[PDB]
Design a protein around this ligand. Sequence first.
Ligand SMILES: NC[C@H](CCC[B-](O)(O)O)[C@H](N)C(=O)O
Ligand SMILES: [Mn+2]
Ligand SMILES: [Mn+2]
Ligand SMILES: [Mn+2]
Ligand SMILES: [Mn+2]
Ligand SMILES: [Mn+2]
Ligand SMILES: [Mn+2]
Lengths: 323, 318, 318
Amino acid sequence: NLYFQSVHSVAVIGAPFSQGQKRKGVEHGPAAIREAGLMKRLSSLGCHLKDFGDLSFTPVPKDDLYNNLIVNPRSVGLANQELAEVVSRAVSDGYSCVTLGGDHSLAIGTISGHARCPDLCVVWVDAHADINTPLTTSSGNLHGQPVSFLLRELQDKVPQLPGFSWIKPCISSASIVYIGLRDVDPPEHFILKNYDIQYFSMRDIDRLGIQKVMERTFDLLIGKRQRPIHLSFDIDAFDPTLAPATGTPVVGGLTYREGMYIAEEIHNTGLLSALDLVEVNPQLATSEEEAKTTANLAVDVIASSFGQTREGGHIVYDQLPTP
Amino acid sequence: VHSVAVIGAPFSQGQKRKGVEHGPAAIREAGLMKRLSSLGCHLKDFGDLSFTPVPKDDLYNNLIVNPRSVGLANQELAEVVSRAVSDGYSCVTLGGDHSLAIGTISGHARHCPDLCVVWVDAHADINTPLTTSSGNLHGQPVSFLLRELQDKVPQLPGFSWIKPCISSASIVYIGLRDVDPPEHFILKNYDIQYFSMRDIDRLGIQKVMERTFDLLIGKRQRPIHLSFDIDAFDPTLAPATGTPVVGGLTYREGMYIAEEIHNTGLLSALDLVEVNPQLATSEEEAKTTANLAVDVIASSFGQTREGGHIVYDQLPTP
Amino acid sequence: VHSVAVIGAPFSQGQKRKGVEHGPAAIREAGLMKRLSSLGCHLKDFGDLSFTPVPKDDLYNNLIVNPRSVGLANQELAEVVSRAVSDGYSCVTLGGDHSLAIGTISGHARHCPDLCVVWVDAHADINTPLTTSSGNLHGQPVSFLLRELQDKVPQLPGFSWIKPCISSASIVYIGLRDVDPPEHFILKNYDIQYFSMRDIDRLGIQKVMERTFDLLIGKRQRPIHLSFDIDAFDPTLAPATGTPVVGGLTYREGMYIAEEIHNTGLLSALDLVEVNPQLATSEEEAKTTANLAVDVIASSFGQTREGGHIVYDQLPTP
Ligand SMILES: NC[C@H](CCC[B-](O)(O)O)[C@H](N)C(=O)O
Ligand SMILES: [Mn+2]
Ligand SMILES: [Mn+2]
Ligand SMILES: [Mn+2]
Ligand SMILES: [Mn+2]
Ligand SMILES: [Mn+2]
Ligand SMILES: [Mn+2]
């Protein structure tokens, strides 16, 4: 194959995080996405691949939990400062940065690195809003807290944490739109409602349909002017039947077809500047088929974000072979 | 804050498949009361009723299965429902087969003259004791309750206490997909409005609820009796049911129904029936059906996807 | 009353995967006849056609597997289909792989030259013998039957009898999600209209059927040939198939197609293909795929979710 509808410059990062939460086995995530055949698929889409590989992470020996709840603040904060540089390296070069997880904590870095493109906009695709402040959280796991640090208006409600001094608020209220919300905690709900954070919960997808959801997502974000899109995609935004290998599985999720639609609609704006793919936990499966379904689903999302569709036509066919 | 009464009705005589009596227990074991408390509901556990059995009650006119048992059990239940509604509680009834709606709707009618029904099921349950092919009374409750059908319903043993209390314009169905030919005649002929799986596929559950509430409470506010059969949902979601019919409601559709019922602020009585744990192939499949039932009752009393039930007022500053 | 002809076509040579030849028997064990009977249909069962085996059958241009065996069996089937259409029967063909659609559409077009096709499949099966990557004829049937592709289609051993019977404006695809780059080229350059899963996600199955019928029967009523591949549905619903592809039609959507095909009253021939009971992990996986196929044919001939197929005009009185 030598002809394609569009050629994309794709930078792939493997971030094996496991300290952002407490459930072990989410570190094997970027490795399972590769075993499924991610790079082979991106190559068949006519992409200029620039693999940064699986990054090695070292935990800080003396790392006390802040305010006796926030587990591993130094180990996550430092790892995110460095991942932000790898993302800023690729984006400045002209590459679209794909980050394989791991847990949703790595989103602090990817979005901050992307920002270094100031007029960016995020599309959060999760079952959870991940907008908990270090005070309002109940679990202590930082994977449910990344959006708080990135928002400009939440600066006064978020305290200075150890190894979090490097973060500067980059994205405003109108610059983030959520999709697939079904497990929102009481303080998380207050933040969205009061700070005018426009969102599309599972209920809003039921009422309007994935087509209207995406249309409205782009009318709010890239409506005023053309803006680079950051797509933070969490595997648990899909129904547990489709994505059983995840730490926080919430029933009544997005269908395979809904996720693919989201991914395709992102690809059709031609503004996807970075993508996150998180919560793939191969240790959270009851069978090999369940482990492989989640991995293939993850690949499908990334591929659909860079051309892959149901109609096909990503690969351009020259002429019909005459007999 | 809503005053909610919970009644468990371990009754199986409305059909032949054994195990539906263990339904109220399995919904309770799925933490029903605990979930209802966590939403801020003033609870009143009425317990798991022990019905008076009939020793001599067999096949009537070589068709109707166990009528004296069905009628008496429904009579006793209508008194308990009557007690619950009269005090000021929103009556939750756990089944058990759908023949129990004779009791719950009759008892609710004793205090609510202008009551309207939302019947969420795969079936119409409107067969008369004359149109039924099975003889199973769980597929006949609406015939006894509907006024326009009075002249078409024969006097059954143990059914002499019932008096039709609902009109054809006062009952809307959602999720029909296994309708008998006489049931289809009753629906069409008497103008009983319904939204079948097909109407859901066409219009969508948003328009379905918008249209349902226009039909029932469009002109005036009325107490809502929500009769929800667990078989309304697809057998992949609710496998522990007696009559599984493929092509059912998705989890998202069921919650949306329950959410929009709560959003009227007029829910007065709810039924959650046909949860049969003995019929699921595995223990986890029995738990899936039970937890799904709990989610319906919960969504009907405030639980949502947006997470706006537990009220938050102030954010802590550093 | 519909006169329905049921033809067992145990085709296997169209693909390399073994077991799809047991598909017609699998659909019958799932009570296809009993279901078509109680629908009020006039039945004729031709049994499973015993095709002439070709022992000396070598691969054409070292790629196309079993062309003589496929070509001959399809010519044998085209005669049986032709015979049934002549007797005023709606020709139902139980497969077998989708290569048998060559014989079914061919035999149908002899008596119905103004027929229009509704292709409900995950794939387009429009690969020419010069574009195919697998050399499997089951993914090549439309190529031989398309009029505008004649100059691009070479003459295969035992494929002469085939005269391109349908034009590009007469075939409409529904359920597309695994389209090959040469297949995609044909569909865009020859102007073949289709509705992929993305088109269904955007418009909804109601608008799909309305638009399908606008393209095919918008100017006049024509005989409808419904070529239904079981892999058009999601693999969770239809597990026992040779080429499963994720993100398929929901059970509700597949029945909607069928119910709409019936509402026109124009269905002249129907193929139900790719039901492979060997490729199922468990006994219930095969039976689920078979029963699903039985729901498809039955829905295409009257079976509804509302129940209005059997006539009911008067209620029994006590
Ligand atoms: N990936 C297999 C495809 C064939 C499916 C045919 B079927 O199952 O739809 O009949 C493919 N396009 C091919 O040419 O071999
Ligand atoms: Mn997350
Ligand atoms: Mn999540
Ligand atoms: Mn019922
Ligand atoms: Mn039912
Ligand atoms: Mn096919
Ligand atoms: Mn196919």
